[PDB]
Design a protein around this ligand. Structure first.
Ligand SMILES: C[C@]12CCC(=O)C[C@@H]1CC[C@@H]1[C@@H]2CC[C@]2(C)[C@@H](O)CC[C@@H]12
Lengths: 256, 9
């Protein structure tokens, strides 16, 4: 309800004041691009990205009021969706939607996209990226959206305390609405802009859903293709991820 | 999980 003349910047300050910094993967580009070194690097990046998201999430407003197991759960799910989005925001402001900027030391160009044995999905991620430009997504809009994503995937069975969750997911959708509603007063373009982002958000689920199948399978024929897996990485992919596949855990789409 | 719940604290 940002009305009057002041108040409300509070929320928008958090996301900004708590947005993780830069993250390196540890991939020496000065080496022949092989499916091994590549995927093995992205895997190392994933772990390195997880920790930040963890700290990042515990800083979120009202996030702490969530149950532990839940917090651990939720984070263990939408993690994929988030990273893809963040990475999308990186490739945009940086390589101006043309290359998959995963990390300073890891820039996915056409060639690598192929050698990664996953050129298909890469396109989708390079799509969601180009979208930021078209929809003219603003930083505030992103920082806010990325958060919402966190609470955008739960088991149809229900968390260990649904109420708190819904409440927060609720309060967050408003902030998104509160940010969108800060440029002019008219309940027209708002119902329009909101519709846009919401779509964008849901369009993330598919990719995630896709990037999941790939990593899981990769975990199976892991040793074969000789690709290392971080202690924490393999964990989620073998338990948490499978649930998303087994259908026990499902995303939360605004539309249909 | 096990190795992650630690970071939550
Ligand atoms: C989330 C990461 C790493 C962080 C990021 O910027 C997005 C990117 C999307 C593809 C993921 C990758 C982590 C490692 C995964 C999960 C590989 O196993 C296969 C798909 C990879």
């Amino acid at each position: 309800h940002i009305e009057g003349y002041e108040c409300q910047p509070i929320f928008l300050n958090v996301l900004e004041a708590i947005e993780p910094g830069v993250v390196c993967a540890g991939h020496d580009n000065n080496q022949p691009d092989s499916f091994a070194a590549l995927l093995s690097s992205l895997n190392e990046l994933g772990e390195r990205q997880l920790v930040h998201v963890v700290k990042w999430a515990k800083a979120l407003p009202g996030f702490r009021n969530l149950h532990v197991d839940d917090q651990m759960a939720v984070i263990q799910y939408s993690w994929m969706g988030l990273m893809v989005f963040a990475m999308g925001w990186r490739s945009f402001t940086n390589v101006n939607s043309r290359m998959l900027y995963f990390a300073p030391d890891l820039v996915f160009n056409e060639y690598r996209m192929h050698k990664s044995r996953m050129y298909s999905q890469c396109v989708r991620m390079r799509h969601l990226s180009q979208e930021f430009g078209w929809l003219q997504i603003t930083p505030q809009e992103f920082l806010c959206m990325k958060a919402l994503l966190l609470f955008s995937i739960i088991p149809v069975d229900g968390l260990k305390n649904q109420k708190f969750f819904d409440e927060l997911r609720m309060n967050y959708i408003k902030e998104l609405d509160r940010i969108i509603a800060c440029k002019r007063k008219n309940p027209t373009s708002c119902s329009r802009r909101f519709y846009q982002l919401t779509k964008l958000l849901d369009s993330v689920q598919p990719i995630a859903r896709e990037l999941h199948q790939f990593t899981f399978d990769l975990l199976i024929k892991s040793h074969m293709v000789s690709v290392d897996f971080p202690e924490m990485m393999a964990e989620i992919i073998s338990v948490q991820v499978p649930k998303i596949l087994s259908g026990k855990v499902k995303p939360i789409y605004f539309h249909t | 999980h096990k190795k992650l719940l630690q970071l939550l604290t």
